[PDB]
Design a protein around this ligand. Structure first.
Ligand code: ZN
Ligand code: ZN
Ligand code: ZN
Lengths: 118, 55, 109, 56, 49, 112, 105, 154, 99, 756, 115, 112
C-alpha cells in the first residue's frame, strides 16, 4: 500500500492511544528509549539540509543528519535520518510532524530502532 | 551556544527550546494544542461530574 | 482557507419583481467583478437570480456579507450554487478546433 | 418593528384559568411572560421621563 | 535596515493566551439549579481529593 | 497592566501570571476563560431576568441577585469544613463517636 | 424465512458441512420458522461455508454456537432437499435498525 | 553531482510568502496594526490633483507597477514590480507624564526598488522603514506623479 | 389536529359528563390532552359557536373594532360573537381582498 | 474597563447534538466524490429492436464519450505544458449555458454598468468611505414572504432549497399544462420521503414504488441524483435514498439502460467506504442494476472509465466490474477482460484490468475454480512487465487467487512459479513484499515434497525481514509465517531454534496491540505456532506480560493464552508455569478499565482447561472475589459475579462447602442492590451455582430463596427480568416441590405481565 | 441462477432484436486463418469509430476464437460500441467473409484472394 | 441566531433541575427542548412564523405562591409559546443593550 496510507497508520495509532487514554510509560513510543534517530520520508526532491534542519529544529537541537541522495547524480532521494539530542525531542517530532505538507508532499516521520551509520 | 531568541515558542509537554537556527515559523500538526485542550477539559468535566455525585 | 463548496456561482431569492438589472448589477457590484447575471423568467423562476462573479474570493466575500440584505422592504436570500449537473454536450467540434489552434499556436507537440 | 410589537401586545391578552374561573386579561400586563422584563423596563423609562422632564 | 525574504510568521503583537488557561471550566447555567435547596451544593471539592 | 506587558513582550501570558488573581475581583477574574465565554457574551439583562423568574418558577430562590456564570462564584467555603473537623477533634476523635471501629475497615480512608 | 418474503436462499447443491446458528437465533427451524421437534441436520453449499464464514449463523450472520436443525414438518414434506438454505441477502431489517441506532445513540 | 550543503533553499520561503504565483518579498512584522486616525493620500501629477485614497483600512499596502498583487499600481515603467510597502506599525512612545504609550504609525519601506523612492524628494534607504508625517510628499523612481499625505484633522 | 371520530366522541362525552371534568374526558381518547379538549370544545365544537358567513354589519363592526383596539382579539371576539380564530382569519381575508 | 470584557479571548454549540454528515469522515481521497457532475442525456442503442439512428439528437453515444475524453486528457496535457513555459480558471458562455438550467434571461444591464463592471475589479479597494431616528410605515411584504411549503409538508431545510425550490411557490395543476411538470411537482414528494415522520415515509414509499413506471425513469433520476450528490448528506437520508433507488430499480427493468452510467457515478463511493452496511448495500444494488441492464450495456458504458485519468474512478471502477462479473457469471465477461489486460495504449488500462481480477477473486472466492486456468493466463503477462506498479499489483492478484482456490489448482499456477521465484531473490522494498505474499499463499497448495524444498528455501529470506520496519512488510511476513511455518511437513526444533527468538523479540510490541488488524493477525500466528510446537514454550514466553501494565497488551496476551489452551489443552504445564499463569490472571483481572469479556472468558477457559490441578489456589480466588464483590462497584462487582458464574463448576467439584454456602448466602444478601446491571449478574451466578449443587442442598434453602425472588420480577429492566425469570423457571421445573400453591399463583399473576 | 425476479436480457434481446440475413451458416475457426483477416477488421472499425480502440479490437478477436463463435451474441455485444445499425451491417459484411475463407481450401477469404 | 437560541434553551431547561418527579406538560416541554436542540433551523423557522402570524393564543394558568407575608402570582404558559417568548426576549435585550436604549439610571443592571 502506497505510503500516504503509512502516514494514516501512525496518526491512527496516536489517536487510538489517546482514545484508550493509556499512560505514557506504556505508550508505543516507549519501546525506543534508546534512539535519537528519526526517519523522514516523502521529502520533495528539492529540500537540502539547511531547510530540513531549520524546520525540524522546532523541537530541539540536531546532533546529526544524513540525507540519502543518489551519489551518481547527487540528487536527493527524498528521505533522510535525523539524530536529535534527546529522545524526548524525537517523541515530540514524531507526534507533531507526521503528516505535515511541505511543498505539496506530505512527509512521514517515524522513530528508528537501529540506525545504520553510512 | 547560539540559542533561539525569536518571538514565541509554543508550549510542549517538555517545554524545550527550539534549536539554534530554527527557521522560526510554526509548522505543526497542531496535535500539541489538541492534547493540551483535551488535557484541561478532562479536569473540567471531572469537577463538573463530582458536583453531581454529591447531589 | 476556503470551504470548498464556495463558488463564483450564487443563487438569490426574495427578489423584487421588475427590479432594474442596473440596480442589481450595482448591488452585487460593490463586491467584485460580475462575470454574468441571469434572472428567472417564468412565474416560478421570475424573482430568483443566478449571479456569477469572476473570482471565488469576491464570491465568498459577497455571500458572507450581503447575506440577509434588506432591499425593498424584504430580506434577500443568498446561497452557494451546486453546479452538480449539466444540460448540454460539450461541442467536440469547437473544442477540438480551438485546441488545434492552441497546439499549433505554441508549437507544443 | 410593528410585527414584533403586535406580537407582544397581543400575547398580553389571554384567558386566565384557575380551576374553574376564567377571564380575559385585557387591562393589565401578565408579569409572567418571558419578556415582561423588557416591557416593564420600557414603561419605566417612560415614566422616568415624566418625573425628570426631558431637560434633566 | 530590515533583512527581508524571511518566512512570514502570521503573528500579531497583540497579547495572546496559552491554551492551558482556556477551557478550565465548562457550563452555561448558574450552579444554583434554579434555587434548588434539597441538593448539597455547599462546597465544590472532595475533602480528600 | 499585565495585558499591556504581555503585548510589549508579544509573548502570550500564562497561568502563573494569573495564579494569584485566579479568583479575586468582583467579576471573578476566572470568568474570562470559561468554555462558554463566547455565547455568554450574547446574554444581556441576565440580572433582571433572574429577578422576574419569581413569576414563573414556583419555588423561591435565595440567590436571585447573582448568576454563577457571568459573575463567578463570590464565596468559597473549603476552609470552613476543615476547621470544623479540626475543632471537633480530628478524624480519630470524631470516629470514636460512631460505629466505625465496629465494622473494622482497617482504615477510614476508604470511607466512600 | 416465512416472515420477510424479501429473503433469498443460496439454493445450490448441499454438501457435507453442517450449519450453525447464533446464540441469538438458536433453537428454531430455518424454514418452517417454528421452535420445535428438531429431526435432522442442516447441510450447506460449499461456497456458503468457504472463507471466514466457517461457523456462522446462517440467519443472523454471527458466531456459530450450535447446530441447525429441521422441524418434523419440513422433513416430512421434504423441504429439506433444496440445498444450502444460506441466506445470501442481508435484508432491510438489520440495516435499518443499525442505521436508526447510529442516529439515536 | 552535488555535495550535501547546510545552506538554505527557498522552499519554505516560497510557500510561506508566495501569492498568486508571485512571491512577495516582504512580510508584515508583528506590530502590524490599523489606525484610529483615518489617513488619506492626495495624489497629484504636475499640479493636477488626483482623487484621494483612504488607506486607514489595512495594515500593509503594496505599491509598484504589477497591478496583480500590488495594492497600488504606480504606472511608471521606472517602477519595479514589487517596489514599496506602506505599513502601519504600533510604535511605542512616552506620554508627557512619562507613562509609556504606543501609536499606530505610518511607515513606508522600499524593497530595493530600481530607481529610488523620494521622500520630500530625498531618495531613501531600501529595505528600511521611514515614518511619514503630515503634508509630506512622495515620488517613486522618476514618475511624473507626486503625493501628499494627510488625515482627517490634517 | 382533530379527526371527526375524536370529534364525535367529544360531543358525546361532554353532553354526558358536563363541562367541568376534563380529566375524565381526555382520559378517554388516546393522543388527546385535557387542555386540548377544553380548548377545542370552547373554540369550535360547542353549539353556541355560530357558523355562518359575515353579514355586512358584522364586518363593519369587526373592521371598526380591530381599528379601535389593535390586535386584541380575545377582547374583540366576544363583542361580535365569534371565536378569536374566526375574527382573526376573517379580518385577514377582508384585508387581503382590499389589497 | 468593560473594554476588557468586550475583548473575547481566543460558531454554534449544537455540534454536540447534531448528527454527523459523511462529509466529516472523508479524506482527500474521497474528496473527489463530489467533484463529479451529471452529464447530458445518454442515448440507448437498443431502442426499437436496434433502430436505425436519427441524427441531431444530442444524445451522447460511445463515439461522443470517447472523443470528449480524448479532448479532456489532451487539453490537460497542454495545460500542464503551457504551465511549463510560464479551478479558478474563467469560463466560456457556452460553459455557462452548460452550468445553468433553463428559464433565465441573460443581462448586461447598461453598457455603462458593464463599463462600471469594467472598473469593478479595476481599483475596488480605493473608494470614498462607505443613522438616526425615523418612524416606520406599515407594509406587508415581510408577512408576505414564505419560506416553507404549504400543506402537510415537512419542514424544508435551508440547504435543500436549491433542489426543492419549486415547492415554495404555488400554481394550479391544470395551469401546469406541462403535465410532465405536474409529474415533477408531485414527484417532489421526495422531500416527504427525505424529511418526515415514519408514516409519511411509508406512504410516500408505497406511492413511488407503485407509480414508478407511471412516472418513468427520466424524471425520477433527474430529480434524485442531485440529492445524492449533496455534500450535506447525512446517513439516514442516504440509506433512505438508496432504498428507494433500489425499489424503483426493481420496477423499471430495462428503462434504466440510458441511465446506468449516472447510477454508477453516484453509487460507486459506497463501494469504498468505512461503513460496512453501506458497502454491502451499494454492492448489492450494483449487482441488481447489472442484472437489470443487459451485459453489453454495462460493458460498453463503463469501459471508458478504465482509461480515465483520475485514479479514484479507476479504483472504484475495478471494484464495480468485479461485482457485475459476479452477477452475470465470469465466462461471459472473460473476453472483455482478456482484451483490457492486453491493452497497449497506456499501462493504466492494464493495471486496472489486473485489479479487476484481484477483486473478483476476493469477492466470489471458491466460485472461481473452473476458470482458474483462464484467469491466470489473463493475468500472468504482467508478472514480468518492466513497469513496477503492474508487477506489484499482479503479484497481489496471484495471491488472492490462491487464497481463494485453496488446496487445488496448483497445476494451473505451475506456469507462473518461476517468474515469482526469479523476482523474489533480486527484488527490493515493495516488489519483495508482494512476491512474498504470493509465494506465501502458494506454498500450502503444493505437495509435501516439492513444497518442503520450496519452504526451507523461502524461510531463509523470511528470517532476514523480521527486523524490517516497513509496516506491510511486517504484516505480510506475519501471515506468511502462519502458513509456511505452520505446515504439516516441517519440524519442531527448526522452528523452535531459528524462528521463535526473533519472532517474539520483534513482533511482541505495544505498537502492534494498538493497531486493529495486527492484533488479530499476531494472535492467529502465535496460535499456529502453538498448534505446531506445543504450548509450554510459547506460553512460558508470553506469560509474564500478563503482568505488563499496558492494558491492550494484557488483553492480547490473555486472549492468546486462552485460544491456545482452547486448542492444546492443559496437559503440559509444570507447577511453576501455572503459578505464574494464575498470578498473571489475577493481576490482569485486578485491573479492568473497561468491561471486557475477554479477560473473563480467558479466566474461565484457563480454569476449565486446568481441571482439578488448580485446587490449591481456590481461597485467593475467593479472596479476590469477595473484596471485589464489595469494592466501590459499578464494574467490578458484576465483574466478579460473572467470574463466579463461569467458575461454579470447579469451585463446587473441589468441595468448598464453607465457600459454597458462603457464596450462596453472600449473594443472597446482595439481592437488594439498586443497580440492575449488577443484580442481574448476581442472579446469573446464583443460577450457575444451583445448576451444580442440586436443589435440596442449597444453603439458602429454596423455600427461603423463592419468596425473596418474587419481588424482583417487577424490575422492568432487561437484564434483571431475564436472569431472574430463567432462574425461577429452572427452580419451578427441577426443585418445584418446596413451594406453596400460594407462592405459585402469586408468580402466576406476576408472570402474566412479563410478556411486554 | 439465484433470483427469478429479473428477466434474462439475453433471451429478451435475442427475441426483440433485428438481425442480419446470413448469420446462420455455422462457422468454425479451425477451418480459417485469422491474421490475414484482422487488418480488415482493424481498418474497418478504425473508420467506423473514427479513432483507434485497442480494447474493442481485441474484443472482437477474442470473441472469434472459440471453435464456434455465436454471431448473434457478437452482434449484440457489439451493438453497444457501434451505432446498433452499424452492428448489423458490420456483421452482414463479416459473417459471409468467414463463409468465404471457410469454403476456401487454404482457409483464406475470396475477396482477399483476389486482393 | 443560534447563539441566542441556545441561551434561551439553557435558560428554560434549567428549571427542571431536580428532575425526580414530572408532570404531563412538563414532560412535553422537556421533549420540546430536546427536539429544538437537534434541529435549530427547524425551531428558528417555527419561531419566526409565530412572530409573523399568530395573534391569538392559548390560555395561561395562574396560581399563587405563598411567602406567609404576601402572596405572589406564578403563571404558566404553554410550551411552544414559552420557547418563542424566550427567544424573543434574548433578542430584544441583546439589541436594546447594543443600541443603548436603557439609559444608565435604570438599574437592576448587568454590571453590578
Ligand atoms: Zn421448518
Ligand atoms: Zn450455499
Ligand atoms: Zn442468528
Amino acid at each position: 500500500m502506497n505510503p500516504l496510507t503509512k502516514v494514516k497508520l501512525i496518526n491512527e495509532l496516536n489517536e487510538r492511544e489517546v482514545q484508550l487514554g493509556v499512560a505514557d510509560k506504556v505508550s508505543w513510543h516507549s519501546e525506543y528509549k534508546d534512539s535519537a534517530w528519526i526517519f523522514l520520508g516523502g521529502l520533495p526532491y528539492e529540500l537540502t539540509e539547511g531547510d530540513i534542519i531549520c524546520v525540524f529544529s522546532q523541537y530541539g537541537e540536531i546532533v546529526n543528519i544524513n540525507l540519502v541522495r543518489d551519489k551518481k547524480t547527487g540528487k536527493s532521494k527524498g528521505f533522510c535520518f535525523l539524530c536529535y539530542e534527546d529522545q524526548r525531542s524525537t517523541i515530540l517530532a514524531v507526534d507533531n510532524f507526521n503528516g505535515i505538507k511541505i511543498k505539496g508532499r506530505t512527509i512521514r516521520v517515524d522513530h528508528v530502532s537501529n540506525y545504520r551509520a553510512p | 551556544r547560539p540559542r533561539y531568541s525569536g518571538p514565541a515558542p509554543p508550549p510542549n509537554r517538555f517545554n524545550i527550546w527550539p534549536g539554534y537556527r530554527w527557521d522560526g515559523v510554526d509548522r505543526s500538526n497542531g496535535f500539541e494544542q489538541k492534547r493540551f485542550a483535551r488535557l484541561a477539559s478532562k479536569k473540567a468535566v471531572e469537577e463538573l461530574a463530582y458536583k453531581w455525585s454529591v447531589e | 482557507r476556503l470551504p470548498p463548496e464556495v463558488n463564483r456561482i450564487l443563487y438569490i431569492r426574495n427578489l423584487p419583481y421588475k427590479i432594474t438589472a442596473e440596480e442589481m448589477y450595482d448591488i452585487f457590484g460593490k463586491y467584485g467583478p460580475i462575470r454574468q447575471i441571469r434572472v428567472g423568467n417564468t412565474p416560478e423562476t421570475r424573482g430568483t437570480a443566478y449571479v456569477v462573479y469572476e473570482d471565488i474570493f469576491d464570491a465568498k466575500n459577497a455571500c458572507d456579507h450581503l447575506s440577509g440584505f434588506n432591499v425593498c422592504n424584504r430580506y434577500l436570500v443568498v446561497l452557494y450554487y451546486n453546479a452538480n449537473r449539466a444540460f448540454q454536450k460539450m461541442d467536440t467540434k469547437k473544442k477540438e478546433e480551438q485546441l488545434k489552434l492552441l497546439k499549433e499556436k505554441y508549437g507544443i507537440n | 418593528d410593528h410585527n414584533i410589537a403586535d406580537y407582544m401586545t397581543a400575547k398580553n391578552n389571554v384567558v386566565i384559568n384557575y380551576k374553574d374561573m376564567n377571564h380575559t386579561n385585557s387591562y393589565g400586563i401578565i408579569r409572567g411572560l418571558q419578556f415582561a422584563s423588557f416591557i416593564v423596563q420600557y414603561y419605566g423609562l417612560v415614566m422616568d421621563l415624566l418625573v425628570l422632564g426631558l431637560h434633566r | 535596515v530590515i533583512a527581508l525574504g524571511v518566512p512570514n510568521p502570521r503573528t500579531s503583537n497583540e497579547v495572546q493566551y496559552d491554551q492551558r488557561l482556556f477551557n478550565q471550566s465548562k457550563g452555561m447555567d448558574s450552579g444554583f439549579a434554579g434555587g434548588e435547596d434539597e441538593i448539597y451544593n455547599v462546597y465544590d471539592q472532595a475533602w480528600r481529593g | 497592566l499585565k495585558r499591556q506587558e504581555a503585548i510589549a513582550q508579544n509573548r502570550r501570558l500564562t497561568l502563573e501570571d494569573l495564579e494569584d488573581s485566579w479568583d479575586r475581583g468582583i467579576p471573578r477574574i476566572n470568568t474570562l476563560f470559561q468554555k462558554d465565554r463566547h455565547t455568554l457574551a450574547y446574554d444581556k439583562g441576565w440580572r433582571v431576568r433572574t429577578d422576574f423568574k419569581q413569576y414563573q418558577v414556583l419555588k423561591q430562590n435565595p440567590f436571585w441577585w447573582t448568576h454563577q456564570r457571568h459573575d463567578g462564584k463570590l464565596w468559597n467555603l473549603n476552609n470552613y469544613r476543615t476547621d470544623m473537623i479540626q475543632a471537633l477533634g480530628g478524624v480519630e476523635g470524631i470516629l470514636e463517636h460512631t460505629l466505625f471501629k465496629g465494622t473494622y475497615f482497617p482504615t477510614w480512608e476508604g470511607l466512600f | 424465512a416465512k416472515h420477510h418474503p424479501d429473503l433469498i436462499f443460496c439454493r445450490k447443491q448441499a454438501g457435507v458441512a453442517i450449519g450453525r446458528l447464533c446464540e441469538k437465533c438458536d433453537g428454531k427451524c430455518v424454514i418452517c420458522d417454528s421452535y420445535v421437534r428438531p429431526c435432522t441436520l442442516v447441510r450447506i453449499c460449499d461456497e456458503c461455508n468457504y472463507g471466514s464464514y466457517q461457523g456462522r449463523c446462517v440467519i443472523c450472520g454471527g458466531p456459530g454456537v450450535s447446530d441447525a436443525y429441521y422441524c418434523k414438518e419440513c422433513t416430512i414434506q421434504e423441504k429439506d432437499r433444496d440445498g444450502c438454505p444460506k441466506i445470501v441477502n442481508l435484508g432491510s431489517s438489520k440495516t435499518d435498525l443499525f442505521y436508526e441506532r447510529k442516529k439515536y445513540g | 553531482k552535488e555535495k550535501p550543503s547546510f545552506e538554505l533553499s527557498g522552499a519554505l520561503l516560497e510557500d510561506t510568502n508566495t501569492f498568486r504565483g508571485v512571491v512577495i518579498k516582504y512580510s508584515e512584522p508583528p506590530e502590524a496594526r490599523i489606525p484610529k486616525k483615518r489617513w488619506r493620500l492626495y495624489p497629484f501629477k504636475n499640479d493636477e490633483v488626483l482623487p484621494v485614497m483612504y488607506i486607514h483600512r489595512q495594515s500593509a499596502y503594496l505599491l509598484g507597477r504589477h497591478r496583480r498583487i500590488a495594492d497600488i499600481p504606480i504606472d511608471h515603467p521606472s517602477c519595479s514590480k514589487q517596489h514599496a510597502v506602506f505599513q502601519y506599525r504600533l510604535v511605542e512612545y512616552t506620554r508627557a507624564d512619562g507613562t509609556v504609550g504606543r501609536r499606530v504609525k505610518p511607515y513606508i519601506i522600499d524593497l530595493g526598488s530600481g530607481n529610488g523612492t523620494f521622500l520630500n524628494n530625498k531618495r531613501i534607504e531600501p529595505q528600511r522603514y521611514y515614518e511619514l508625517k503630515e503634508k509630506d510628499v512622495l515620488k517613486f523612481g522618476f514618475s511624473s506623479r507626486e503625493y501628499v499625505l494627510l488625515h482627517e484633522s490634517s | 389536529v382533530w379527526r371527526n371520530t375524536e370529534d364525535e366522541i367529544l360531543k358525546a362525552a361532554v353532553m354526558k359528563y358536563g363541562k367541568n371534568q376534563w380529566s375524565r374526558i381526555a382520559s378517554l381518547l388516546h393522543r388527546k390532552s385535557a387542555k386540548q379538549c377544553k380548548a377545542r370544545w370552547y373554540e369550535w365544537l360547542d353549539p353556541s359557536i355560530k357558523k355562518t358567513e359575515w353579514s355586512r354589519e358584522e364586518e363593519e363592526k369587526l373592521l371598526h373594532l380591530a381599528k379601535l383596539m389593535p390586535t386584541q382579539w380575545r377582547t374583540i371576539a366576544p363583542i361580535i360573537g365569534r371565536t378569536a380564530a374566526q375574527c382573526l382569519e376573517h379580518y385577514e381575508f377582508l384585508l387581503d381582498k382590499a389589497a | 474597563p468593560v473594554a476588557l470584557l468586550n475583548d473575547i479571548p481566543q460558531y454554534d454549540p449544537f455540534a454536540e447534538h447534531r448528527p454527523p454528515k459523511i462529509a466529516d469522515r472523508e479524506d482527500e481521497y474521497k474528496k473527489h466524490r463530489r467533484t463529479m457532475i451529471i452529464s447530458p442525456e445518454r442515448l440507448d442503442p437498443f431502442a426499437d429492436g436496434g433502430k436505425t439512428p436519427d441524427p441531431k439528437m444530442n444524445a451522447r453515444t460511445y463515439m461522443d464519450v470517447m472523443r470528449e475524453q480524448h479532448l479532456t486528457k489532451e487539453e490537460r496535457e497542454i495545460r500542464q505544458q503551457l504551465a511549463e513555459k510560464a479551478r479558478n480558471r474563467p469560463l466560456s458562455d457556452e460553459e455557462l449555458d452548460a452550468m445553468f438550467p433553463e428559464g433565465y434571461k441573460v443581462l448586461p444591464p447598461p453598457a455603462g454598468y458593464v463599463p462600471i463592471r469594467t472598473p469593478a475589479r479595476k481599483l475596488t479597494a480605493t473608494p470614498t468611505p462607505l443613522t438616526g431616528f425615523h418612524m416606520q410605515t406599515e407594509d406587508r411584504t415581510m408577512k408576505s414572504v414564505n419560506d416553507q411549503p404549504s400543506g402537510n409538508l415537512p419542514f424544508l431545510k435551508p440547504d435543500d432549497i436549491q433542489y426543492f425550490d419549486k415547492l415554495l411557490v404555488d400554481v394550479d395543476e391544470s395551469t401546469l399544462s406541462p403535465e410532465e411538470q405536474k409529474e415533477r411537482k408531485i414527484m417532489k414528494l421526495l422531500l416527504k420521503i427525505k424529511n418526515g415522520t415514519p408514516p409519511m415515509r411509508k406512504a410516500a414509499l408505497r406511492q413511488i414504488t407503485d407509480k414508478a413506471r407511471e412516472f418513468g425513469a427520466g424524471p425520477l433520476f433527474n430529480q434524485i441524483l442531485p440529492l445524492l450528490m449533496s455534500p450535506t448528506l447525512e446517513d439516514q437520508e442516504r440509506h433512505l435514498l438508496v432504498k428507494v433507488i433500489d425499489r424503483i430499480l426493481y420496477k423499471l427493468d430495462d428503462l434504466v439502460r440510458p441511465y446506468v452510467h449516472k447510477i454508477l457515478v453516484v453509487i460507486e463511493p459506497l463501494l469504498i467506504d468505512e461503513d460496512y452496511y453501506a458497502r454491502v448495500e451499494g454492492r448489492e444494488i450494483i449487482s441488481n442494476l447489472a442484472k437489470a441492464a443487459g451485459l453489453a450495456t454495462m460493458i460498453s458504458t463503463m469501459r471508458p472509465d478504465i482509461d480515465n485519468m483520475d485514479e479514484y474512478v479507476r479504483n472504484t471502477t475495478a471494484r464495480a466490474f468485479a461485482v457485475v462479473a459476479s452477477a452475470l457469471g465470469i465466462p461471459s465477461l472473460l473476453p472483455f477482460l482478456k482484451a483490457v489486460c492486453k491493452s497497449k495504449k497506456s499501462w493504466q488500462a492494464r493495471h486496472t484490468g489486473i485489479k479487476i481480477v484481484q477483486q473478483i477473486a476476493i469477492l466470489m472466492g471458491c466460485a472461481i475454480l473452473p476458470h482458474l486456468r483462464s484467469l491466470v493466463e489473463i493475468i500472468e503477462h504482467g508478472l514480468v512487465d518492466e513497469q513496477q506498479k503492474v508487477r506489484t499489483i499482479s503479484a497481489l492478484a496471484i495471491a488472492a487467487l490462491a487464497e481463494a482456490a485453496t488446496p487445488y489448482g496448483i497445476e494451473s499456477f505451475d506456469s507462473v512459479l518461476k517468474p515469482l521465484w526469479k523476482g523474489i531473490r533480486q527484488h527490493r522494498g515493495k516488489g519483495l513484499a508482494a512476491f512474498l505474499k504470493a509465494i506465501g499463499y502458494l506454498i500450502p497448495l503444493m505437495d509435501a515434497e516439492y513444497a518442503n524444498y520450496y519452504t526451507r528455501e523461502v524461510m531463509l529470506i523470511l528470517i532476514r525481514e523480521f527486523q524490517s520496519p516497513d509496516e506491510e512488510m511486517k504484516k505480510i511476513v506475519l501471515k506468511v509465517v502462519k502458513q509456511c511455518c505452520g505446515t504439516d511437513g516441517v519440524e519442531a526444533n527448526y522452528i523452535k531454534t531459528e524462528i521463535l527468538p526473533p519472532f517474539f523479540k520483534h513482533f511482541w510490541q505495544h505498537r502492534m496491540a494498538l493497531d486493529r488488524r495486527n492484533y488479530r493477525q499476531l494472535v492467529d500466528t502465535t496460535v499456529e505456532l502453538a498448534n505446531k510446537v506445543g504450548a509450554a514454550e510459547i506460553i512460558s514466553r508470553i506469560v509474564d506480560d500478563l503482568k505488563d501494565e499496558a492494558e491492550q497488551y494484557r488483553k492480547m496476551v490473555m486472549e492468546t493464552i486462552e485460544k491456545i489452551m482452547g486448542n492444546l489443552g492443559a496437559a503440559d504445564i509444570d507447577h511453576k508455569l501455572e503459578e505464574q499463569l494464575i498470578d498473571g490472571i489475577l493481576y490482569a483481572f485486578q485491573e479492568q478499565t473497561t468491561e471486557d469479556s475477554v479477560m473473563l472468558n480467558g479466566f474461565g477457559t484457563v480454569v476449565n482447561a486446568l481441571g482439578k490441578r488448580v485446587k490449591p489456589y481456590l481461597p485467593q480466588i475467593c479472596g479476590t472475589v469477595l473484596w471485589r464483590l464489595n469494592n466501590k462497584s459499578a464494574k467490578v462487582r458484576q465483574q466478579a459475579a460473572d467470574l463466579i458464574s463461569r467458575t461454579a463448576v470447579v469451585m463446587k467439584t473441589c468441595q468448598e462447602e464453607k465457600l459454597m454456602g458462603h457464596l450462596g448466602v453472600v449473594l443472597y444478601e446482595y439481592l437488594g442492590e439498586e443497580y440492575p446491571e449488577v443484580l442481574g449478574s448476581i442472579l446469573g451466578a446464583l443460577k450457575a451455582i444451583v445448576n451444580v449443587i442440586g436443589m435440596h442442598k442449597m444453603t439458602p434453602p429454596i423455600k427461603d430463596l423463592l419468596p425473596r425472588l418474587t419481588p424482583i420480577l417487577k424490575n422492568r429492566h432487561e437484564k434483571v427480568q431475564e436472569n431472574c425469570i430463567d432462574l425461577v423457571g429452572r427452580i419451578a421445573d427441577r426443585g418445584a416441590e418446596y413451594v406453596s400453591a400460594r407462592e405459585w399463583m402469586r408468580i402466576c399473576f406476576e408472570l402474566l405481565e412479563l410478556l411486554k | 441462477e439465484q433470483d427469478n425476479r429479473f428477466s434474462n436480457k439475453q433471451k429478451k434481446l435475442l427475441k426483440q432484436l433485428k438481425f442480419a440475413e446470413c448469420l446462420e451458416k455455422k462457422v468454425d475457426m479451425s477451418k480459417v486463418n485469422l491474421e490475414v483477416i484482422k487488418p480488415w477488421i482493424t481498418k474497418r472499425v478504425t473508420e467506423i469509430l473514427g479513432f483507434e480502440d485497442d480494447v474493442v479490437i481485441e474484443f472482437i478477436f477474442n470473441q472469434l476464437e472459440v471453435k464456434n463463435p455465436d454471431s448473434k451474441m457478437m452482434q449484440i455485444n457489439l451493438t453497444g460500441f457501434l451505432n446498433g445499425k452499424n452492428a448489423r451491417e458490420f456483421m452482414g459484411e463479416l459473417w459471409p467473409l468467414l463463409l468465404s475463407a471457410q469454403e476456401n481450401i487454404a482457409g483464406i477469404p475470396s475477396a482477399f484472394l483476389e486482393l | 441566531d443560534t447563539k441566542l437560541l441556545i441561551l434561551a434553551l439553557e435558560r428554560l431547561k434549567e428549571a427542571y433541575s431536580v428532575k425526580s418527579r414530572l408532570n404531563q406538560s412538563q414532560r412535553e416541554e422537556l421533549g420540546l427542548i430536546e427536539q429544538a436542540y437537534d434541529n435549530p433551523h427547524e425551531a428558528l423557522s417555527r419561531i419566526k412564523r409565530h412572530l409573523l402570524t399568530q395573534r391569538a393564543f392559548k390560555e395561561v394558568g395562574i396560581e399563587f405562591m405563598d411567602l406567609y407575608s404576601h402572596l405572589v402570582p406564578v403563571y404558566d404558559v404553554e410550551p411552544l409559546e414559552k420557547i418563542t417568548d424566550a427567544y424573543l426576549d434574548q433578542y430584544l435585550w441583546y439589541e436594546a443593550d447594543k443600541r443603548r436604549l436603557f439609559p444608565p439610571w435604570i438599574k437592576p443592571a448587568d454590571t453590578e
